[PDB]
Every structure is written in structure tokens, then in C-alpha cells.
């Protein structure tokens, strides 16, 4: 199926007494794999299959790198605030990563945000930065003048990131590549007099990606469907639902298996 690896950074200027100034967390798919912040000042594993398969040297090396990245992030956020003439607490964020799709193709992405909004977005295919405004445009011109760094980022997204992901996928395969099929039921109830709500509910499934819809016999999708979020149930599995009201049938697809419930 589709898998992804990504690393986030978050920088907060003038943080409250409890909030750290800098946090970095990595993910494989929906699973945290690594964590670092300005208080621990240590990069640590966040999944046992990460801890068990990477030697201490890995954590020690990336700890040193993160301590450097933390300082840069603080300085970059200060410069951004100055450009915008902003005072008080603001945020700066980075996301880098890649996906390996089932069909074999890959994606890579590298993006920055300021105060939780898109700021700069890297296009690895064109080797250029998209800027949302003139401040980002200022930063863009600096970065685009550095040809080697752009090439390095492209190479990391397309080759290194993908190799890390495959490696991590193998480490956590018993978790990441398992399948737990959904438990699906359809509930019926007259709500407001004259209107019967139909809920198609799924739970107990992994991976979280699931497709759910309602169809009217025979096969036409209709029409004002309400979708429930895919939510973690706490035991590593997920739950979700879709509802309509009024021959209907709920259709569920999960991990290559299709399910139909006639109402």
C-alpha cells in the first residue's frame, strides 16, 4: 500500500513557561518514530521497532544535527518576524518527506509555514520555491541562488528519503504492513418525525485509510452524505462512519477488500 516518511520541525518564539522553543518529530505513515526538543536536547525513538533496530550512534549523530537545526530555526523565525514587523509569539514550521505508492511511483515534498499557514513550498521537479507573498519571495531568491543545495534537496527527497522509508518499513513491518479488517454495521432510526437516519459505522480497522459511501439501488451515489472523521480508537485501530437519510446500501473498501451492506 501507500507509505510515507516525514520529519516536522516546530519553532515557537517567546513560548509560555511550558511550551518548548523547538520540537522535531518524525513519522512513518501515522506512526511517530522519532522526537527531539529544546528541553531534552536529545533525539529519541518513539516506536519500539525504531529503538530496536537503530544503534546508539544514529541517535547521537542526529542529536548533534538537531541541536544545530534548532539554533538555525530560532534565527530564521526571528528574521521572519522582523520582515513582517511582528512582535510577540509566532510559529515557524517545516515538513520534509516522501511517499512510496503501491503502484511503485514516488513523491517528495519540502515545505515551510509561518504561523500555521503555507509560506514556502519546494518543487523538486522544477528545482524552485513557490512563495506566498513578498516576504517569502525575499527568502526564495536567496535559496534559489544556491544551485547545489537545491540539487541536494532533490536527491534527498527522491533517493535518500525513499531508502530510509524502505528501511523503516522493514523494521516496523509487523505493525506497518499488517491488516485488520473493519467491523461494519448499519444502524437505522427515525429521528425527527418522518425522517429516518441511516448510519454506516466501521471500527477496529488498520490501516486507517478506508473508503465508505452510500448508494441507492442500483448503483448511483446519492446524495447528501455526512462523513465521520477517521479516528484513532486507542488500541492502534481506527473507526469512522458515513450517514444519510431516506433500496440503500453502504459500501466499504479497505485494503483491497470490498464490503456491501444492504440497508
Amino acid at each position, epitope marked *: 500500500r501507500t507509505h510515507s516518511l516525514r520529519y516536522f520541525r516546530l519553532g515557537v518564539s517567546d513560548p509560555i513557561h511550558g511550551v518548548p522553543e523547538f520540537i522535531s518529530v518524525g513519522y512513518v505513515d501515522s506512526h511517530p518514530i522519532t522526537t527531539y526538543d529544546s528541553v531534552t536536547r536529545q533525539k529519541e525513538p518513539r516506536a519500539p521497532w525504531m529503538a530496536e533496530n537503530l544503534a546508539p550512534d544514529h541517535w547521537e549523530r542526529y542529536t548533534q544535527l538537531l541541536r544545530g537545526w534548532q*539554533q538555525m530555526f530560532k534565527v530564521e523565525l526571528k528574521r521572519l518576524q522582523r520582515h513582517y514587523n511582528h512582535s510577540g509569539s509566532h510559529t515557524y514550521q517545516r515538513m520534509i518527506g516522501c511517499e512510496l505508492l503501491e503502484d511503485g511511483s514516488t513523491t517528495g515534498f519540502l515545505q515551510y509555514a509561518y504561523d500555521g499557514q503555507d509560506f514556502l513550498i519546494f518543487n523538486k521537479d522544477t528545482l524552485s520555491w513557490l512563495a506566498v507573498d513578498n516576504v517569502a519571495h525575499t527568502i526564495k531568491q536567496a535559496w534559489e541562488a544556491n544551485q547545489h543545495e537545491l540539487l*541536494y534537496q532533490k536527491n534527498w527527497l527522491e533517493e*535518500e528519503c525513499i531508502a530510509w522509508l524502505k528501511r523503516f518499513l522493514e523494521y516496523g513491518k509487523d505493525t506497518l504492513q499488517r491488516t485488520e479488517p473493519p467491523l461494519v454495521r448499519v444502524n437505522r432510526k427515525e429521528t425527527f418525525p418522518g425522517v429516518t437516519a441511516l448510519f454506516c459505522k466501521a471500527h477496529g480497522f488498520y490501516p486507517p485509510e478506508i473508503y465508505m459511501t452510500w448508494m441507492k439501488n442500483g448503483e448511483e451515489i446519492v446524495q447528501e452524505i455526512d462523513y465521520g472523521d477517521i479516528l484513532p480508537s486507542g488500541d492502534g485501530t481506527y473507526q469512522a462512519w458515513a450517514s444519510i437519510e431516506l433500496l440503500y446500501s453502504c459500501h466499504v473498501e479497505h485494503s483491497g477488500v470490498h464490503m456491501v451492506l444492504q440497508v
Partner: antibody
Amino acid sequence: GQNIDQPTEMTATEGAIVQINCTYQTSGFNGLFWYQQHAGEAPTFLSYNVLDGLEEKGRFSSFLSRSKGYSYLLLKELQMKDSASYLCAVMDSNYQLIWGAGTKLIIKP
Amino acid sequence: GITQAPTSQILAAGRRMTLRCTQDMRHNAMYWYRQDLGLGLRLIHYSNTAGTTGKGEVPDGYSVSRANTDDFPLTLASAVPSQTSVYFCASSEAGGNTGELFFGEGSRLTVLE
């Protein structure tokens, strides 16, 4: 483990061309640097490659093939002053440099 | 840009030695290498930014500190003859990216019994 190899020494004739090879066996790859170091002097940056191809700077060109795992530094129209050691260095998966032992280039007048 | 001192020193075995290295280019990353005949540069210690340092390939017998961006001193607490070498300090605007290294001169140290 990890390994970066370049010939100990090369000799070519003044006015001619020499190609200095550097092959690398590393877990991952984040680019390859060439440095020049004259005898009794400090090394100085010449080049960086990370994608496939040839990049030209004056009489010096640096080539990279990622699939074949090697780079070369190409010097054209050799001059006596090109006598120096040339250091190859590869950035591995954890962004650390691994240095080759250097190639001493000798030039016959 | 970046400077090392002393650039030459003879030292009796057992004595304490500190090699100084300063750069004024506001580089965050600094490195100490030793260069020996027949070998590639070997990293002793490094520092990606002020307030941290990390061990290189051959850290034993050496120590560093990085209180400040500008300076990266290399200390031999009790020098031994095998620490006879040429020491190079280098800096880079940032550690781990495509920005090149800038080397000091650097320092020929001879340790004799």
C-alpha cells in the same frame, strides 16, 4: 563498512589532460566534494556534485555517476602549478564526510 | 577568515597542549581533523553550533569546547608521540549540507619523548 578510493598518485604531461577517479561504497549518499591541497598548504574547495552529470569550472570539471558510484575530477591543459594532491570526500547517509586518502598529481614538463 | 594557532609546536610527551581556532565568518559548524601520510583526513571532534560538540572518528586523547560561535579549541590533556600530526581546523556555514569547508593553515605538532 564504508569506503572511498582514489589512486595514490598520477603523473601526466604538461599541456595534456588528466582524469582523477574517486569511487565510493557508502550506505547512502548526499554528495561528493573535490578539494585541492598543495604540498604544505591547506585544502581548498573545488567542486560538489550530487546529481548525475558534469560541471565545469575553468579548466576543472567534476563528473558524477550515482549508479556507478564514482566521480572524476578532470583537469584540462595541465600546468605545472596543477601539481598538488586532490582530495575526494563523500557525504554519507548521516551527512558526515568520509575522506579519500588523496591523489598526488605529478606533472611532467 | 579562519585562523589556527600555533601553526608549529614541538611538545614533550605528557604535557598539556591547546590548539586555538577562530573564524569570523559566523559559521555554525567547526571541525578538527588530523592528517597523516597515507590516510584520508580523520575527524577528531566537531561542533554543529555553539553550545554542543560531538565525537569524530578518532576522539581519544583529545577534547573540545564550543561556548562561542567564533572559537573551537582543541585540547590534548597529556600528549603522546602518536599525536604527532598535522592538525586542520575547518568551518562551514552549516553542518551537513552542500556548503563547503573552509580550512585554517593549520598546525604541525611534533610530540617527542
